[PDB]
């Protein structure tokens, strides 16, 4: 009653890859709005960082 | 725009507007840039001009800056998202997973955005500075 | 399959996209993570006969390959309560419901597809299983806890 029994253990390791995955679910969805928003507005910043016009106010942004 | 940052620009724009006239000319500009430092090429003059639909007095001035700086998050809103990968709350991230995270994942970072980024960024001992980081791109520090 | 677990796949692909950079393809090493999202519990040697790979770089697949991969997982054969006590009833030597940490540790790491002592330690955790002043767990009561999954 060996093989059976390995089977049965493989059978219950996958039951508990699957639990840990489905833990883990939950916290990549949060994390992918987290990783998102630093990641477009890290890029809003290097736009802005070019634009002429705030090239310009930042340079008299001092001598106020 | 706040208060404080509409009042801020009316002074930007004082000095801006060289000869006082109340509207913002490409001779002005061009003034006012020499006199900073090394001025842009009038062909990148002409074109922020362009950018105002009509004539360049306060109200369009205020205006084309409102439109640029809108539609991004609010200060605790990034540092949240931050927050996110720091569970400890130690305030830093390390040097390597905030760099694996933006170059790797998600839409990920090429080599010159990921080059903007860090050179401009809080860099101590190993730990990236998240919050000052966010205060920088959202102007409440730089 | 029905349209609404091929919307559900379409979230959970989407989901694993962007976490290897969002590029519409899922790396074929994560083919086994993203059918147990969906709920189902198929072992390694399962996933890789529908094409999962044994590292990461290896392979991509895009949406319409990751849908026969699932559709032929879902008949993946799943283990029940009662091969589950049976199994845990032949390291039972005082016959009284108790396997000791060790033993338990030993199984899991050791036999079948052995999980690392890093998955063993943090499904300890999880499920909250104590060790009772002798060492000895209820497997039962670990057993229905595993089966109930994280939200439960
Ligand atoms: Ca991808
Ligand atoms: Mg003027």
Redesign the interface.
């Given at each position: 009653?060996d093989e059976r029994?390995?089977?049965?253990?493989?059978?219950?390791?996958?039951?508990?890859?699957?639990?840990?995955?489905?833990?883990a679910?939950?916290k990549?969805?949060d994390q992918?709005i987290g990783l998102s928003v630093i990641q477009r507005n890290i890029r809003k910043w290097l736009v802005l960082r070019n634009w002429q016009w705030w090239k310009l106010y930042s340079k008299v942004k001092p001598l106020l | 725009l706040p208060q404080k940052q509409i009042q801020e620009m009316k002074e930007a724009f004082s000095m801006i507007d060289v000869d006082r006239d109340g509207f913002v000319s490409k001779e002005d500009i061009k003034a006012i840039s020499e006199q900073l430092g090394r001025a842009p090429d009038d062909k990148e003059l002409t074109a922020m001009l362009k950018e105002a639909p009509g004539p360049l007095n306060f109200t369009m001035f205020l205006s084309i800056f409102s439109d640029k700086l809108s539609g991004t998050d609010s200060e605790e809103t990034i540092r949240n998202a931050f927050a996110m990968f720091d569970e400890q709350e130690t305030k830093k991230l390390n040097i390597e997973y905030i760099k694996d995270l933006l170059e790797?994942?998600?839409?990920?970072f090429n080599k010159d955005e990921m080059r903007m980024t860090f050179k401009e960024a809080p860099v101590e001992g190993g730990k990236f500075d998240y919050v000052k980081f966010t205060a920088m791109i959202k102007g409440s520090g730089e | 399959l029905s349209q609404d677990e091929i919307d559900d796949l379409k979230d959970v692909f989407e989901?694993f996209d962007?976490?290897?950079?969002?590029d519409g393809a899922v790396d074929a090493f994560k083919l086994?993570?993203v059918c147990?999202?969906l709920?189902?519990?198929?072992?390694?040697?399962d996933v890789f006969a529908v094409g999962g790979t044994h590292k990461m770089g290896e392979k991509s697949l895009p949406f319409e390959e990751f849908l026969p991969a699932y559709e032929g997982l879902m008949d993946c054969?799943?283990?029940t309560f009662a091969?589950?006590m049976?199994?845990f009833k032949?390291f039972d030597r005082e016959g009284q419901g108790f396997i000791s940490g060790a033993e338990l540790r030993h199984?899991?790491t050791a036999?079948?597809?052995?999980?690392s002592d890093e998955?063993v330690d943090?499904?300890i955790k999880?499920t909250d299983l104590q060790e009772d002043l002798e060492g000895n767990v209820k497997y039962e009561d670990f057993?229905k806890k595993?089966?109930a999954?994280?939200?439960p």
């Amino acid at each position: 009653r060996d093989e059976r029994l390995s089977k049965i253990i493989s059978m219950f390791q996958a039951h508990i890859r699957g639990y840990l995955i489905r833990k883990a679910y939950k916290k990549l969805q949060d994390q992918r709005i987290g990783l998102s928003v630093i990641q477009r507005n890290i890029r809003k910043w290097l736009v802005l960082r070019n634009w002429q016009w705030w090239k310009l106010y930042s340079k008299v942004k001092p001598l106020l | 725009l706040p208060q404080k940052q509409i009042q801020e620009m009316k002074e930007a724009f004082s000095m801006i507007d060289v000869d006082r006239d109340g509207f913002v000319s490409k001779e002005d500009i061009k003034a006012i840039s020499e006199q900073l430092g090394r001025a842009p090429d009038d062909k990148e003059l002409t074109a922020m001009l362009k950018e105002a639909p009509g004539p360049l007095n306060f109200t369009m001035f205020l205006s084309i800056f409102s439109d640029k700086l809108s539609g991004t998050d609010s200060e605790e809103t990034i540092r949240n998202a931050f927050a996110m990968f720091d569970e400890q709350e130690t305030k830093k991230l390390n040097i390597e997973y905030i760099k694996d995270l933006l170059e790797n994942m998600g839409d990920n970072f090429n080599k010159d955005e990921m080059r903007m980024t860090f050179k401009e960024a809080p860099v101590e001992g190993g730990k990236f500075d998240y919050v000052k980081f966010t205060a920088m791109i959202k102007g409440s520090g730089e | 399959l029905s349209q609404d677990e091929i919307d559900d796949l379409k979230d959970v692909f989407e989901l694993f996209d962007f976490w290897d950079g969002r590029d519409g393809a899922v790396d074929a090493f994560k083919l086994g993570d993203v059918c147990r999202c969906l709920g189902i519990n198929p072992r390694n040697e399962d996933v890789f006969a529908v094409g999962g790979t044994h590292k990461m770089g290896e392979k991509s697949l895009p949406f319409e390959e990751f849908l026969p991969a699932y559709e032929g997982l879902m008949d993946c054969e799943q283990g029940t309560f009662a091969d589950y006590m049976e199994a845990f009833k032949t390291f039972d030597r005082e016959g009284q419901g108790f396997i000791s940490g060790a033993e338990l540790r030993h199984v899991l790491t050791a036999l079948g597809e052995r999980l690392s002592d890093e998955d063993v330690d943090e499904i300890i955790k999880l499920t909250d299983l104590q060790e009772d002043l002798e060492g000895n767990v209820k497997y039962e009561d670990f057993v229905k806890k595993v089966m109930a999954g994280p939200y439960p």
